[PDB]
């Protein structure tokens, strides 16, 4: 097979070899942001930048078009039971497929509800962001992501917004609209996934707007001017209203 | 089984000669490259033997074929010496078939459903094959030398460009007609062994599988596989010794490992490599013999069945 | 054969869990040391097809 | 024990324990140590 | 030394890629060689960049290194193992020496017999049925219907059945359909089964 | 020589090459590939101006995907078949 | 690969060393697990720079009540099955040695 | 008498058994002409459909690489309309239709003909399920091995033809079409140019044909209880069985085809020898002995599944329709079923 010559294959092989030889694990980035004010980190060496209760602030039960999807199950059940169309055995049995597939979109919506960030922290060095979220069943998932892997989207959520000049924070510091950011690589439950979109709801307080914007735009934060606040206010498995 | 034979129709001598010549011609034309690869593998392994371990023990026929093709000669490079090989095979087949048919006609049983025992048939076939191989030895020598030229260093090559050219060069440069019969004893031994180690196992397994599964069509080909395997097992050492004797150049300095005879070559092979060294190129030899036997049997059976139907024999008599 | 426990049959303590995790990650790195990275694999898969008719855009 | 002598017939009373062709009994047949 | 046994000099030795970096002949028995240690610079840099704001690590750009083949099991040395296990009868004392090298280690050997091991079910069933012709010599043979009126009329009844089918009663039964149509025809001295009967023709009497 | 301590050319196994294996044109193509493996990048011909279509001048976000992938890739080259996507996708099948 | 700050790790565990903190950060653990592992290692004296094998899974140096520093090695263990236990004498995970006599000297 | 080996012909006496059915009886429709005709028809149709699908998918990908993919139904409709009118799409359709005609006649037709030849006589059990299916395994294996290398020359010719179009004018052969390239390559580069290093294609074809034909034949009889007792839809059951068969064939065939990427496309470590020494067989052995399946199962669908599975599914359906999987079933207590009628009612 190799004896067959194809310039496209040769170009692909050359591109792969050149990439492997040139690009290394270590990379140089000049996107460094120096905050004006000193950063007060928690007792754990982290600074909280975002907080919200997406499950509390979202619609769970009566959601469109999932109500429409689930309202047709009785119709199919009645049609199968009474055979109003006078169908054959297999034809009438074919009507029982819909009840087994109508609830899947609601399951996917409930799963997506757990990708709205509940809590966001920036670690020492301004290179790691910890995002904590929860599922509708109360399971809590926390994941650490490097700041460079964030990419904000436009308000319409259909395109990548310019990282440098992005207008998603109001003058005071809060979000104009529910922000969306795509993480190139997300490690969730010890499994790496590609191009995962997460959301910050507009109905959520934003702490340290400068740090939040820097993390969103992917800049590495300079944390040289820092202080440590020894306050043990948060307990393990602490309760919250995101249930 | 002594009355299980059905010899209700026997071809004439001229028909046998013509059919054998044509079928052997096409079979040799088809299967020559495998023999070429086998000879090249034997030459390249001569003096070293098998040094791989476990599953890699041996020489890869595909590797040898790829190396030969990489020389730039294409597929025509695998047919070098094909003229000499075909001439030698034709002469051997003609002589062997003539002698075998003459003896068989002389000593045949009267009854049509009775046939000579396997022992007697093997004795006659071995005698005929030995005589034919002794008569036609120089052609095999020329073909083997032409094949080994590529493997050997340029200075050791003979540069034969045809059967007659090689015969003349051997007669003149080496001196005398005796130089044309080098390896004749080895060729005779190989021919006798191959003749006696093919007809027996084939019938053995064919009858056994017929008894087991009754009358079917795959029985003939399964028996052919078995017979080819056992014939290769029996004959490959003799073929290797014959190849070594043929490749032995006249000049000892040219020779990498000089030999004085069949026994001397066997002793040298045993010394410089284990007994397994007798079976280099076994896969190539097995493939060659099986393909040749299959094509020959298929064509001969088709033609013979057609002739029998024309004559008017019953379905079972065919 | 290689034992799956790596010498730590039970994670009775978080220290044992950490040791097992460290050695497991090292072993996985060693085993994956001989295959291309995610980017290379993805680009090769995406641009595998090379059979077109008209060129010179 | 074929073409290679490993055991010691001096310390072995009988060399017929195992097949071989390189061992011979020190006290051969017809040999009788008598005071 | 012999170059014929050296893969580097002898090109006829087919190197096994799956055994690269492993030499069974060099094992210790007991094995006391370290071939694994901390490995970095593959995906995790060996240098420090935790506080480097101008450097971001991209694990995706993993440079390709030499494949690490799984360790090969030890291969037996016939002469060494035979000498080690050999014990002199009335010359050796019955004891175990202090040295641990005397432990009898298991080393893999030729793999040819394992082919027969893998094929054993096929071989065993063939020996049980085909070689012994169990239950009988006819079960595994291709089935052929008996020839016409063979071996006897009482058993075959071909002619009587043909007459019955050709009779008025046979035609009426076929019309009722409880009895299927005739499956054979009596030709000039031979019985030929119809192609729709789904059976082979009777074997020739010779 | 008879001694096997050192290799000798008498046992050399290298068949002489007389011409390119697949022809002079194939040899020339191989040389051209070696010389310009990456510098020559032919591309398929596609129209550059389509009314209805919108040119693809940037990378699109994941929100534009009609289908959601199940498997994934670790950054070290490992291929993950078991993912949270698979975990959520297996619920209906297991239930049924 | 989200390596935590070695200075922060040292601050959270005052007595740990910069080299140890950097090595822990290099180790592929989430920052919380890195901090916890650093705390445990400093508190026990465990030498994190030890490549675990099938002989010993870790080593530590501890000063006993007599003032002497002694080395403690954590043996590789098995779940109630010596047959499953790997009896080896090399820093290797692979089970290379096969013993016909489990108790050579009885 | 003719050469060294003698094909001894022997006569045997009569033998018969109680039952004349459920063994091997060659079907009357099993002939060289009829089997070849049916196989050629089915293979040609399946290859045409598969090649059209592949051309359409590849042209859609090519258009999407330069224009944003559809955002809604109207955008998808206009995208398909603009794909259909591409000159590249039309040329690819023509050339790949020629390639389908060639391969489906010489590869899929050969596979179907050999399978029918070696498996037509296996009768089934009346009012029951065909047991002793192991007898069919040797036949399917023989057919798969025999017909495995019948597609490698055509595939290599296609690859050479497509790779010639991407070379400069000076170094371009200038093949008018796929048929012209196929006719010219044997005389220009030589026959071995279409067979060198063919192990990946050969093993792929072997696994495909074996695990497709044998699995479909096994399932269509063993799962027949669904429509024989459960009164399920026979056509739907057969469609499900064909889908399972084609999926299994793709799964068992793709890993062997992955050797192409590992040996040729994976980057080479500078200063070190090739991991597999450039041997596809050795790479396949390494894949077979590899611990993790996902590593060589990556790219299963984006690369091979949609280029192979639909063709195999259509081939199975057409073979079933024509009757290449139809066995003969007769009652064992009928007139021709057994030679002992005295105990069929007593
Ligand atoms: C320890 C072994 C244990 C047993 C296992 C065996 C293993 C063996 C291999 C491994 C070990 C190493 C070898 C040891 C061998 C030991 C035995 C021995 O001595 O054999 C050597 C012996 C000879 O080998 P060699 O020493 O190499 O000598 C041969 C030369 O290389 C030949 O040189 P060349 O090729 O150059 O020849 C040219 C040709 C030159 O040609 C000439 O002869 C020229 C002169 C005559 C010209 C005229 C010819 C006729 C034509 C004219 C007719 C008249 C005119 C007609 C009309 C006009 C038209 C023609 O010469 C010949 O024809 C042949 C040489 C003799 C010529 C002298 C005259 C002979 C007259 C009688 C024969 C006549 C017919 C010959 C042809 C055959 C029939 C067709 O070979 C064998 O015996 C072969 C192997 C053994 C075969 C038998 C099987 C034994 C084992 C059975 C199974 C046991 C199982 C149980 C275990 C038992 C353990 C004990
Ligand atoms: C022509 C055949 C036609 C086809 C039919 C064949 C049917 C065969 C039997 C089928 C069923 C079992 C098949 C097992 C095959 C694989 C065996 C295996 O694991 O590889 C060897 C393997 C050695 O390789 P390894 O363990 O991987 O690594 C160590 C190294 O090899 C290095 O180890 P090392 O340092 O110890 O060096 C010595 C090594 C180097 O040699 C080799 O590896 C050469 C290749 C293996 C040859 C094995 C057989 C040798 C002849 C044994 C004859 C009896 C002992 C007399 C002295 C023989 C001296 C040669 O030799 C051995 O280790 C072989 C020892 C064999 C002992 C045999 C007696 C054990 C007691 C009987 C138990 C089984 C009873 C079954 C029947 C029950 C009926 C109710 O040793 C074993 O696992 C021992 C297995 C022992 C039992 C099975 C084999 C004996 C079967 C005898 C015939 C039974 C026939 C019954 C039906 C017909 C009745 C008429
Ligand atoms: C004997 C009977 C014969 C019958 C007739 C047979 C005739 C021949 C049929 C031949 C069919 C060939 C199909 C080729 C498809 C090639 C796709 C491809 O390249 O994929 C590469 C793709 C990766 O591509 P990529 O470029 O890397 O993607 C990156 C993008 O960022 C990510 O991608 P993206 O988000 O940008 O995606 C763009 C999107 C293109 O963008 C759009 O979506 C625009 C169009 C919107 C409208 C969508 C369809 C509307 C309704 C019409 C449906 C017509 C279907 C016709 C074909 C049916 C058979 C496939 O393209 C796709 O992803 C695929 C679209 C294709 C349609 C999929 C939905 C089909 C629903 C069918 C419902 C039933 C219809 C019944 C009709 C009546 C007659 C039967 O990977 C795959 O191959 C994965 C495919 C996975 C498919 C299955 C997913 C569900 C799995 C769960 C199990 C379900 C099955 C259970 C077992 C059942 C059997 C036992
Ligand atoms: C039965 C229990 C009853 C009591 C309850 C007990 C509690 C529940 C059971 C225990 C927990 C099981 C958890 C399983 C899921 C684990 C996570 C996962 O998604 O796995 C992917 C994971 C690979 O993901 P990864 O780690 O990301 O891969 C990275 C590398 O590629 C490294 O990859 P690699 O080198 O390991 O290669 C992976 C490759 C190689 O995998 C294998 O070859 C493994 C063995 C497969 C064959 C045996 C299973 C049965 C096959 C079908 C038999 C026909 C009838 C089926 C229905 C009735 C019988 C169940 O597998 C795959 O690529 C996909 C495998 C199939 C995944 C199925 C996803 C759904 C799992 C949930 C249960 C589904 C039940 C429906 C029926 C089963 C559908 C598969 O592979 C596995 O964990 C292997 C196991 C896969 C599922 C089978 C094991 C459970 C069932 C055992 C039944 C044994 C008897 C069957 C007799 C059948 C007679 C006809
Ligand atoms: C220490 C070594 C000493 C060596 C020298 C002294 C001893 C020599 C011993 C020689 C033994 C030869 C055995 C031949 C093979 C027999 C095998 C056998 O019986 O198998 C059973 C079978 C029995 O066959 P069957 O005919 O009974 O029927 C088989 C079918 N059933 C079983 C149903 C009856 O025999 C064969 O198949 C034999 C086939 C080969 C026959 C030919 C043998 C060689 C003849 C050579 C003739 C001369 C050639 C030219 C020589 C020129 C130079 C002089
Ligand atoms: C038992 C009593 C007899 C007397 C005592 C025993 C003395 C004789 C001992 C002989 C030992 C075996 C020697 C051959 C070993 C071959 C090993 C091997 O496979 O090498 C690799 C070779 C390599 O062959 P290759 O070169 O084709 O390589 C292909 C393999 N790859 C792809 C991996 C490279 O393999 C073979 O040839 C396999 C078949 C071997 C068949 C050996 C038959 C030996 C028969 C000798 C006597 C003649 C037959 C008599 C009986 C039948 C006829 C009546
Ligand atoms: C777990 C293992 C066992 C699996 C179950 C097997 C059950 C049957 C026994 C077979 C044992 C060997 C394996 C062969 C499998 C494939 C062939 C097969 O199964 O044969 C059956 C079939 C004829 O059977 P059929 O006529 O359909 O039976 C009903 C008739 N009313 O025959 C055919 O289709 C023709 C096949 C011809 C070739 C068969 C070769 C078999 C070789 C077996 C090993 C022989 C070893 C001999 C050793 C000798 C030592 C001196
Ligand atoms: C065959 C028995 C031996 C084999 C192993 C059996 C294991 C049993 C484990 C329990 C779960 C499986 C369900 C039971 C077995 C299959 C159904 C069966 O036994 O057939 C009979 C059943 C009911 O028919 P019945 O009413 O009894 O017929 C009287 C007619 N007057 O007929 C039906 O209703 C048909 C139902 C078929 C379901 C098959 C499911 C298993 C096969 C693999 C999965 C197939 C998935 C795709 C199915 C597509 C169907 C269109």
């Amino acid at each position: 097979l190799n004896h067959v010559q194809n310039m496209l294959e040769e170009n692909l092989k050359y591109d792969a070899q050149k990439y492997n030889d040139e690009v290394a694990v270590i990379q140089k980035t000049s996107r460094i942001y120096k905050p004006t004010y000193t950063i007060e980190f928690n007792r754990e060496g982290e600074v909280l930048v975002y907080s919200a209760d997406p499950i509390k602030n979202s619609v769970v039960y009566f959601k469109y078009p999932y109500v429409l999807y689930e309202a047709a199950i009785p119709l199919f059940i009645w049609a199968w039971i009474y055979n109003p169309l006078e169908l054959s055995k297999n034809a009438v049995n074919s009507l029982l497929i819909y009840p087994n597939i109508a609830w899947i979109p609601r399951m996917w919506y409930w799963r997506s509800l757990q990708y709205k960030i509940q809590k966001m922290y920036l670690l020492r060095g301004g290179k790691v962001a910890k995002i904590e979220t929860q599922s509708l069943a109360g399971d809590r998932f926390t994941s650490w992501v490097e700041t460079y892997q964030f990419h904000p989207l436009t308000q319409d959520q259909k395109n990548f917004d310019n990282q440098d000049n992005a207008e998603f924070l109001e003058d005071e510091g809060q979000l104009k609209y529910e922000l969306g950011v795509q993480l190139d690589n997300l490690q969730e439950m010890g499994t790496t996934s590609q191009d995962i979109v997460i959301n910050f709801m507009k109905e959520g307080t934003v702490h340290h707007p400068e740090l939040f914007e820097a993390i969103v735009k992917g800049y590495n934060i300079d944390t040289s001017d820092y202080v440590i606040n020894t306050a043990n206010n948060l307990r393990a498995r602490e309760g919250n209203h995101n249930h | 089984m002594n009355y299980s034979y059905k010899r209700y129709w026997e071809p004439s001598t001229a028909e046998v000669i013509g059919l054998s010549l044509s079928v052997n011609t096409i079979s040799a034309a088809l299967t020559y490259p495998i023999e070429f690869v086998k000879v090249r593998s034997q030459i390249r392994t001569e003096g070293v033997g098998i040094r791989s371990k476990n599953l890699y023990m041996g020489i890869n026929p595909n590797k040898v074929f790829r190396e030969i093709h990489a020389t730039g000669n294409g597929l025509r490079g695998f047919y070098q010496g094909f003229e000499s090989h075909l001439i030698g095979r034709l002469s051997y087949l003609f002589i062997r078939n003539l002698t075998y048919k003459i003896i068989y006609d002389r000593t045949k049983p009267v009854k049509a459903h009775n046939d000579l025992s396997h022992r007697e048939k093997g004795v006659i076939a071995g005698f005929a094959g030995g005589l034919a191989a002794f008569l036609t030895s120089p052609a095999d020598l020329v073909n083997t030398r032409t094949i080994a030229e590529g493997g050997k260093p340029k200075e050791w090559r003979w540069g034969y460009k045809g059967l007659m050219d090689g015969i003349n060069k051997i007669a003149a440069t080496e001196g005398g007609n005796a130089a044309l019969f080098r390896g004749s004893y080895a060729n005779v031994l190989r021919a006798v062994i191959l003749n006696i180690s093919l007809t027996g196992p084939f019938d053995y397994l064919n009858e056994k599988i017929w008894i087991t599964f009754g009358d079917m069509t795959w029985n003939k080909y399964a028996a052919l596989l078995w017979a080819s395997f056992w014939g290769s097992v029996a004959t490959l050492p003799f073929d290797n010794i014959r190849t070594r004797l043929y490749a032995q150049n006249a000049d000892p300095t040219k020779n990498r490992l000089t030999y004085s005879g069949w026994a001397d070559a066997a002793k040298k092979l045993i010394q410089h490599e284990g007994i397994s060294g007798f079976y280099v190129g076994f896969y190539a030899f097995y493939i060659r013999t099986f393909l040749y036997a299959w094509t020959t049997v298929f064509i001969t059976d088709k033609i013979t069945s057609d002739w029998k139907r024309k004559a008017g024999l019953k379905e079972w008599q065919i | 054969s290689t034992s799956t426990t790596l010498g730590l049959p039970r994670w009775y303590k978080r220290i044992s869990y950490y040791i097992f995790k460290i050695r497991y990650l090292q072993h996985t790195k060693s085993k994956m040391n001989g295959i291309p990275g995610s980017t290379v694999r993805l680009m090769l898969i995406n641009r595998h097809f090379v059979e077109y008719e008209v060129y010179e855009k | 024990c074929i073409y290679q002598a490993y055991q010691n017939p001096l310390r072995h009373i009988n060399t017929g324990h195992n097949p071989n062709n390189v061992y011979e009994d020190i006290v051969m047949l017809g040999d009788y140590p008598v005071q | 030394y012999d170059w014929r046994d050296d893969p580097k000099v002898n090109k006829d030795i087919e190197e096994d890629i799956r055994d690269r970096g492993w030499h069974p002949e060099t094992y210790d028995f007991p094995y006391t060689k370290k071939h694994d240690d901390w490995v970095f610079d593959v995906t995790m840099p060996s240098q420090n960049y935790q506080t480097d704001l101008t450097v971001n690590i991209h694990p995706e750009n993993k440079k390709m290194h030499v494949m690490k083949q799984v360790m090969r099991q030890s291969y037996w040395d016939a002469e060494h193992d035979m000498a080690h296990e050999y014990d002199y009868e009335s010359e050796d004392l019955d004891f175990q020496c202090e040295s641990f090298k005397s432990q009898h280690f298991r080393k893999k050997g030729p793999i040819s017999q394992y082919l027969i091991l893998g094929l054993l079910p096929i071989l065993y069933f063939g020996t049980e049925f085909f070689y012994n012709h169990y239950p009988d010599e006819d079960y595994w043979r291709v089935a052929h219907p008996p020839p016409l009126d063979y071996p006897d009329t009482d058993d075959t009844d071909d002619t009587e059945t043909f007459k019955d089918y050709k009779s008025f009663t046979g035609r009426r039964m076929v019309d009722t359909g409880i009895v299927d149509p005739l499956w054979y025809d009596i030709r000039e001295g031979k019985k030929v089964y119809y192609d729709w009967a789904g059976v082979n023709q009777p074997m020739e009497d010779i | 020589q008879l001694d096997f301590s050192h290799f000798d050319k008498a046992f050399e196994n290298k068949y002489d090459i007389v011409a390119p294996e697949f022809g002079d044109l194939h040899q020339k193509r191989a040389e051209f590939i070696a010389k310009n493996q990456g510098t020559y990048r032919p591309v398929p011909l596609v129209p550059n101006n389509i009314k209805g279509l919108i040119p693809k001048t940037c990378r699109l976000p994941a929100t534009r995907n009609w289908y959601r992938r199940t498997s994934s890739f670790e950054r070290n080259g490992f291929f993950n078949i078991h993912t949270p996507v698979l975990n959520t996708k297996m619920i209906p099948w297991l239930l049924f | 690969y989200c390596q935590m700050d070695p200075e922060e790790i040292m601050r959270r565990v005052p007595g740990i060393t910069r080299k140890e903190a950097e090595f822990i950060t290099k180790l592929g653990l989430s920052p919380q697990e890195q901090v916890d592992f650093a705390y445990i290692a400093y508190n026990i004296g465990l030498d994190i720079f030890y490549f675990t094998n099938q002989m010993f899974v870790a080593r530590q140096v501890v000063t006993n009540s007599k003032g002497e520093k002694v080395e403690v090695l954590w043996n590789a263990q098995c779940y109630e099955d010596i047959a499953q236990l790997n009896v080896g004498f090399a820093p290797v995970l692979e089970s290379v040695d096969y013993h016909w006599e489990i108790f050579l000297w009885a | 008498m003719f050469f060294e080996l003698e094909d001894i012909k022997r006569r045997h006496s009569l033998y018969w058994d109680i039952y004349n059915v459920q063994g091997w009886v060659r079907r009357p429709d099993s002939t060289l002409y009829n089997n070849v005709k049916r196989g050629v028809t089915a293979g040609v149709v399946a290859s045409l459909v598969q090649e059209n699908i592949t051309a359409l998918v590849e042209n859609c990908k090519l258009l999407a690489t330069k224009y944003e993919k559809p955002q809604n139904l109207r955008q998808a409709a206009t995208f398909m309309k603009e794909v259909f009118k591409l000159e590249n799409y039309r040329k690819a359709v023509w050339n790949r239709s020629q390639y389908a005609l060639c391969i489906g006649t010489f590869d899929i037709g050969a596979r179907l003909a050999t399978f029918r030849w070696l498996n037509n006589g296996w009768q089934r059990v009346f009012a029951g399920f065909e047991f002793n299916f192991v007898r069919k395994i040797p036949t399917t294996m023989l057919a798969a091995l025999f017909t495995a290398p019948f597609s490698v020359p055509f595939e290599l010719a296609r690859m050479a033809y497509y790779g010639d179009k991407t070379f400069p004018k000076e170094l371009q052969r200038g093949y008018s079409s796929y048929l012209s390239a196929l006719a010219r390559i044997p005389f220009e580069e030589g026959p071995y140019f279409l067979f060198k290093n063919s192990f990946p294609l050969i093993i792929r074809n072997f696994f495909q044909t074996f695990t497709l034909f044998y699995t479909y034949d096994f399932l269509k009889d063993k799962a027949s209880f669904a429509w024989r007792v459960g009164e399920q839809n026979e056509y739907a059951c057969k469609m499900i069985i064909a889908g399972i068969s084609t999926y299994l064939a793709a799964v068992f065939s793709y890993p062997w085809m992955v050797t192409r990427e590992m040996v040729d496309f994976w980057p080479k470590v500078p200063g070190a020898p090739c991991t597999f020494n450039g041997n596809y067989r050795k790479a396949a052995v390494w894949i077979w002995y590899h611990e993790f399946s996902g590593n060589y199962f990556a790219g299963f669908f984006t690369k091979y599944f949609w280029k192979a599975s639909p063709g195999m599914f259509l081939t199975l359906m057409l073979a079933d329709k024509v009757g290449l999987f139809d066995q003969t079933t007769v009652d064992n207590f009928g007139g021709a079923g057994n030679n002992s009628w005295e105990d069929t009612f007593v």
Side-chain angles (χ1 to χ4, degrees), chain F residues 78-82 86 90 94, chain H residues 291-294:
Chain F
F78 190 88
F79 184 78
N80 294 339
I81 304 179
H82 188 196
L86 182 64
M90 61 172 64
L94 268 53
Chain H
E291 184 182 4
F292 302 138
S293 300

Side-chain angles (χ1 to χ4, degrees), chain H residues 225-226 229-232 237 240:
Chain H
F225 65 86
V229 184
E231 302 179 3
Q232 248 60 11
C237 289
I240 294 168

Side-chain angles (χ1 to χ4, degrees), chain H residues 1-2 42 54-55 93 106 112-113 155 157 159 162 189 207 217 230 238 252 276 286 309 322 345-346:
Chain H
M1 181 177 245
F2 304 95
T54 57
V93 165
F106 295 112
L112 294 173
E155 187 168 356
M159 289 195 299
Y162 274 100
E189 288 73 14
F207 274 95
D217 194 325
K238 288 183 177 180
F252 294 166
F276 309 98
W286 183 89
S309 296
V322 299
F345 76 103
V346 178

Side-chain angles (χ1 to χ4, degrees), chain F residues 9-28:
Chain F
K9 299 294 182 298
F11 297 85
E12 191 69 6
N13 293 331
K14 288 182 174 177
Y15 306 156
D16 297 356
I17 306 178
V18 300
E21 183 178 2
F22 295 136
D24 195 338
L25 185 65
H26 184 268
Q27 182 63 9
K28 291 182 181 301

Side-chain angles (χ1 to χ4, degrees), chain B residues 1 5 116-124 126-127 130 185 188 192 196-197 199-201 203, chain H residues 10:
Chain B
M1 289 174 59
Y5 303 92
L116 299 179
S117 300
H118 283 7
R119 297 166 178 174
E120 302 178 358
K121 291 191 297 185
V123 168
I124 299 167
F127 176 84
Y185 183 85
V188 167
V192 171
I196 65 183
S197 61
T199 184
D203 185 11
Chain H
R10 293 173 174 269

